[PDB]
């Protein structure tokens, strides 16, 4: 939990794990001053709110710490900050809330909200470090951009300093996915997008690749690879694709792609390499 | 069934004002027909058996074919007496409660018809009770209280903050902002035009971004055409016009693909104007100086003669350098420099030690402290050719510029049409973009009065607010025509009410609306009462006498009274009246509980309330509309939220249960 | 005998903001000292045993000799957190109820002192209850609610109608209007200066008429000096200045006879400026064109050279007339006229039938449809001498004009002083004339708080009323410190209240007042509550925490509530609090009758009410303040005054005595 | 009662006869629309209000018509107009009021007020003959100017269209009378005013005469003569004074004077003539 980008990314994924379709994310001042997360993922009951943050209050209570792996992430944030949790459960309840040390009800829809002032509140330096302002947002902007292409099923609104910046609509199931692709990667990529659909046995490869013929300096900035959801930057795949862009046209310039791979557990194995390669090349011709 | 009817009319040089009367029944209305056919249609309609006119009526052509005419004196049509007279007839001190207070052109007619009636009947006539206005723009309208109160284009303090405008107006051009703000002042109610707008507004959502910036280039084409017409237009105004004309091929292309015939029609209205672009391009520099006064506007290559006179002053600097250099080396004085002066013209200066070592060609024009300046015929010759050529080049420039007004004006109306089209498109696109940005839905229209909202939201408050709006539905009809609303403060009474107002207005400019799904019947008139006593009451009566079976009535805390009972009694009535007699679609916000007995008392009335969950040190306002009624006193609780010291809060609760221990 | 005190301070490049805290008692105040000596005096005064400062404090010279210093980080002084923090400490949503909401420079200091206190004590601190502002201008304090409500210079709708200004501002010059309006925004409370103004205002009443028109000649001298300073001043601005300077000997004479040493002092401040008058008189024409750009400004006889270059173009018209006449004679063509053209220069035109009957001296420059234009060498060389001389005469004119700025500016401050003096005199005289016109009286000041009015009148309403006002007295003191006011609507509650306000303000600019005789003690702060719920409550608390033993508190219809008892309870308290604890001079307008039991309940409270005389089916409002209390419900009665249909009024009275038959 | 000037003058003197020291006189639109008279002269009781205007209501009531010589002037005005009387007596009372259709109480100070709207509710022509209004005020302006110099003891405020025009302050008894002389006749007359004090037996002559030496075209407009208060229409006095201006300096130009004469009757009798003459000439030298 060093950058605001990191606190953002994790607490954005806390709601995703709660089956979320809508996520509001609001910031002011690079993350230093404000961060607000609202989600429609399932909620936190009034018992579970208190001790998820407050650490001798665990002692007596009989392992209800269980429900809350965000509760792990929260506890670290809370001791040295100005945190405000507020949530109403999907289970017919009224909404309840935690501050700074008061628990009382307030009002909210089915889900959870988190409001915050600059995380470190008594550490002199770790704040004094916290990078610029502009750049911190530009990083957060990428955090959301990454998770956005990973999940076409969740609507995300990013705003900065009260003002809306980015509105990623969730595409309907079996819907027009070109909408969301242009929104995240600009219109320049969208209009050169050549889709890909390859399939051998368990392995399945879906996505888009910008036509090398019309790939310019602006487009080359788009290189993201996901495997059953998760992005690793493993150098292996670097070959498979730079092999593919070299083999269609000899000019080895920087490609533009966003590809989705679906296989059964085997962390990285050459099987995967040539599978990738053959998929892309057919598509370019 | 054709009656014995009486009427009166007077005109000033502006337009007409009109009034009527039946002695059988005692009926009394007003109007202000603005033009001739409307005035002729209004005499046709009412068809008075007896018609009054002042001696000096100008447009006599309306009345000389009519029956039972009555020539009257002028003084009888004076507003001063008229107002005074009729005010003591009804007994009021003003005509605020009648909804005609500032319509004096009509009131001379009502004033003269009463002095005649006093004198035609000459007994008491208490079968004449009231007067009401019918409304010019019958895509019907919204009173002054609603307008100042709803802050659609202006707020509380008088800025443009927290406005419906502040949200909707992300229009790129000023002519968009105005027309956006105008459609709000005048909602469209020809069903056909409303649906035309929805079809257009929906088809643009894919092209939201692609179009927007193209229009921000235009600027205010409309106001530029103004100074063009006035002939006060300035260079940089014509410049941004050119920049606007260059966007026309672009817009023509982007809109041809869009699926909406109303879009294809507006695409034509836009136009192209290829030749007009050409002239401005050839005549003017990229961006000249502010005015035309000191030239530098017309580009070289438009006019040969322009460049001719410019070539005389362009033989300037090298002429004077060769002089300065020759004369410096011929005389042997190096401090010799040939310079210009606004005051005296050009000259040749030499430093004081070298000054009397100059040649006898030199004529003194200017002695100094530190030098001597001179003039020579070669310079004085050359002085003329520059100064005059400048003038006449400048003069040609002025000529060419004002001649362009002559060249553009023959299409002046065609340009206004394009200007209107573009202004409207910015509005349409902005709205297409606001429905894109804020997820509004497309509603439909029904036959008879009723509103159904599915999870609707207050479009202003939700955008300014910390948390997301607690969306609520609403279900009103001719069967369920009134809702008694009780509850806590900050319960969201006035909020749940005023939000309803915004839904209608928005739907009725053809725009999408803040809710899941919205269906709506006819609503003509939209009246309001805005907390604060002379003041409070007076406007209430207006809403009574004018509001119809199809209107929208908006009540919040009537009966800020002098006593326990006045307020209650007062209200009890007004409610029963709107359910029993008028039968309008109403929403009644109150604090006086006894009224909650009205769902049982009346047919068509049903209880609702904003429920509050009030606990320990704190309190929760669900911001949700619940079936049933309010609990209790919520003020004592809200007290501290102001900042009340407990000296008082505990004296409050110590007296509260002295009082509440009786009931 | 002595303390233990803590403080915090932060600065921006504008000024300072300050906050303090005693852990023994728990006292918490705010301020915004603007300059250095005030800031040094404020640290001197409070003398904290412990003093906080942000790392980057600029004016360190104040704090480096002080004891128990504590260097703090920047982020701790941020307003966002500060506000957020302190708001949850007191529990409120805002600091409206504390009367410091828009003083953020101070609030960073209060914000940082609390994060430190949280961390210095880390213990229970509900002995820290509130925060309040002390005000630089110990001379005055009138809150925003009073200001927007009293409409002294601006009315509800945003015009200047029905204002105290509309009446008082019969000032002849715009600089009078402003300063008149400014003294209203800031009442003077140095007793000395108030009496200086009364002596001046009284001595002018014989000279009301004699002086008035002299000042209307001046115009806005003040704003003219502005464009003078900026160097944007224009000819006709300098013209009205000259006209102003010519009135100075006149005013000097009229005021020397007047008996008031403050008048004799202001007569000196006016000054004369004989030499400055002389220059303008000699340099400029009576009334030149608008700007200096196109000349025609400097008069002939100021400058020899000016008239020299003018003599070249002065040999213009006669030169061309003799030509036109000689050539018309010589050729025999009478349609021959010598004319000018901006485009081509001068020419000789002849009508088409006579055109080819002209002499061979003529060179064609311009063929027309219905004439032929020609040029000749005599004309074409004379063309130059005119066009150039004009320019250089024009050029000299520009030079001479901007040089005048150099000549006047060494007295620029002395002129501002005269301009200020004259602006002030118009105000003084206007007021001397308003006391002459509207018969106001001269009041006197006393030691301790209290107002005595002898037949006083609401100075605005009486002028807008078609009638003289029902004048009433008022008698308040530390013994009789509160008046519970009940009655009918249009009784004159808010009127009898708001009128009291105007008396103080007027007396406290040294002006005479609408009453027979007025005596007054100290009143520091003037707070108000303005009819219309979240809104109404919040501002109430402000008035509580800030108002003092000497203040004026202005209450009308607090407790427009959610239920029976809330409103009543609420009020009951506020009243008792202002009588029991605070002990301020108050006036309490209410509609909740049970409060009229408070004269018996409290020491220092006494009943009054506006009595109404109801005769049958009309009603009379005495507009007169009576000892005792209100009768009853007056709303049912006022109902019809709106215009209520009797369907309702009779359902009202039919239910009224269903309700009133219990009590 | 033809002009507004006439209705003004008479009802102005109704209050003077009631011992008035303060008289408010307000007009709008040449007198056509509004005329308002308020006085501090003694008041009208609630019995006397009704029958002074309404006419068989006098019969039964026992000669209380007596109190009200204005009641003669009122009755004529009232039958064909929109009149409003309102008054509270100096004696035992609340204020009472009459309109247009109602007698009821309202409020007022010690005295009487009369409010009126344009007369002739059905006469077509008699209104057509009320003048062009501008001139009507200029006449009313003179009405007040005449009665003003006749009574230095009564404060009069003349206003037009709500707006104050002329304020004649009552001079304290035995006070500075130069203040009121300048207000009525301009400052030009005031500074040339040579006072006069002549006395033979019963006869007494007091006042002012503008020095002929410095009498200009502006000053010559001032010629008013009063006898025990009353200005008459007598050619005799014309001689006495034009004799006086001829006899100091031969240039017979138009004089400027305002003189006050106090005698026992010689209605026009030569006694009065040479008394006047001798007073003025001594003063000029
Ligand atoms: N449904 C809602 N969801 C979220 N916020 C709301 C909702 N309704 C109201 N609010 C907020 O609550 C505040 C006060 O509500 P409001 O409707 O003014 O209360 P009220 O019942 O009219 N009583 P008062 O305003 O005190 O006379 C507003 O400023 C809104 O911003
Ligand atoms: N002393 C007075 N003399 C003459 N007119 C008065 C006087 N006092 C009040 N009025 C008029 O009476 C009306 C009532 O004034 P106001 O004080 O607002 O009444 P209120 O008791 O506050 N009730 P409301 O105005 O209905 O809220 C106004 O139209 C005033 O012009």
Author numbering:
A (entry chain C), D (entry chain D): 20 to 73, 80 to 125, 132 to 299, 315 to 331
B (entry chain A), C (entry chain B): 128 to 659, 670 to 800
Original paper wording:
MMR is initiated when a MutS homolog binds to a mismatch. Upon ATP binding MutS releases the mismatch and travels as a ‘sliding clamp’ along the DNA helix, and this specific state of MutS is recognized by MutL or its homologs. Once recruited by the MutS sliding clamp, the MutL homologs activate downstream repair. Here, we trap the transient complex between MutS and MutL to resolve a crystal structure of the MutS sliding clamp bound to MutL.
We crystallized the MutSΔC800/MutLLN40 complex in the presence of DNA containing a G:T mismatch and the non-hydrolyzable ATP analog AMP-PNP (adenylyl-imidodiphosphate). The complex crystallized in several different space groups, diffracting to resolutions from 7.6 to 4.7 Å. The crystal structure shows a novel conformation of MutS, in which the subunits in the dimer are tilted across each other by ∼30°, compared to the mismatch recognition state. Meanwhile, the connector domains are rotated by ∼160° around a hinge at residues 265–266, which moves these domains out of the center of the molecule and packs them against the ATPase domains. The mismatch-binding domain could not be resolved in the density, probably because it is flexible in this state. The MutLLN40 interaction with MutSΔC800 involves two interfaces. The first interface is formed by the largest β-sheet of the ATPase domain of MutLLN40, and the ATPase and core domains of one subunit of MutSΔC800. The second interface involves the side of this same β-sheet and a looped-out helix of MutLLN40, and the newly positioned connector domain of the other MutSΔC800 subunit. We observe nucleotide density in the ATP binding sites of both subunits in the MutSΔC800 dimer, and since we crystallized the protein with AMP-PNP we modeled these nucleotides in the density. The subunit tilting has occluded the original DNA binding site, but because the connector and mismatch-binding domains have moved, a large channel (∼35 Å wide) in MutS has become accessible, which could easily accommodate a DNA duplex (20 Å diameter).
